[PDB]
Symmetry: C3
């Protein structure tokens, strides 16, 4: 008279939900790659911006033996403020990924134990 079939669906449903949660974790990682990839493109642009500062005046002296070069800074490079703050951002993600993996591990162990107990009821 036990409703094992109803429990099997409920237990099975939890497994389905757990799988979808895992898919979100992999999807989230793909998004992180896009953001980081954009930064790499930004660094390439900074190099080119520095070149523009080098460009100042060509042939602006055909009656003098001198050339005016004005390589004024162009791209503001972040040495410590963004790096320290960005590492903190990455660090928070690392703790969340480690905490989520722990919870997923317990769920998998608990999920299998719940199904195992169900078989013992009528097996």
């Amino acid at each position: 008279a036990q409703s094992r079939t109803l429990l099997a669906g409920i237990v099975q449903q939890q497994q389905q939900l757990l799988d979808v949660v895992k898919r979100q974790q992999e999807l989230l990682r793909l998004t992180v790659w896009g953001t980081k990839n954009l930064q790499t493109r930004v660094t390439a642009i900074e190099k080119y911006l520095k070149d523009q500062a080098q460009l100042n005046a060509w042939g602006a002296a055909f009656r003098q033996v001198a050339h005016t070069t004005v390589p004024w800074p162009n791209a503001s490079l972040t040495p410590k403020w963004n790096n320290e703050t960005w590492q903190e951002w990455e660090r928070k993600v690392d703790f969340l990924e480690e905490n989520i993996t722990a919870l997923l591990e317990e769920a998998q162990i608990q999920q299998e134990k719940n199904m195992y107990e169900l078989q013992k009821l009528n097996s």
Copy 2:
């Protein structure tokens, strides 16, 4: 003597969790739009950077009938390496979205079946 009320809460709870998971999928899509939107802005900047290369020296020749134009490349355009890698990134998201939709469909069908079975117990 069956604990249908406890099961109704458990079954109902799974429905609530399923709804929240769906909300994350829509929220994830909004984040993807922001990343892609930034790239469109980056392309506009590349056009302007090319213009800076065109700027070289104006009036740098008032004793000669010539003008020095130095349009040296400025923005490094990605033709195949980033596109092929980016398509792979988008492709992975497409498979994950299709797999998540399949799991959600099964959960909805299974979720309704679990509630339907519960009514048959006392209906």
Copy 3:
């Protein structure tokens, strides 16, 4: 003869899944900060690009009492089209965060009620 132990695992499992979902919400917020942070860097670049337009020709006139300054626009600033569309993007996230918080609140209240009912069965 009630399978409270099986229910305790199922009820406990839902709590574990709820916790992981909350972790995704915090992880999603960290990703939003990275995207917004990139835009701040982009604004700094726009200021520098304007400076490049100012750079035109230095000393390109050693036989005339005039200087040619050509500060042609460089960074295309978005005043209304991107802001209005971006606010809509942020607005959608705000409604999703508010809706997810509501669902989480109901789950927590319902989750505790389900455990409370279980104790009454044998307490």
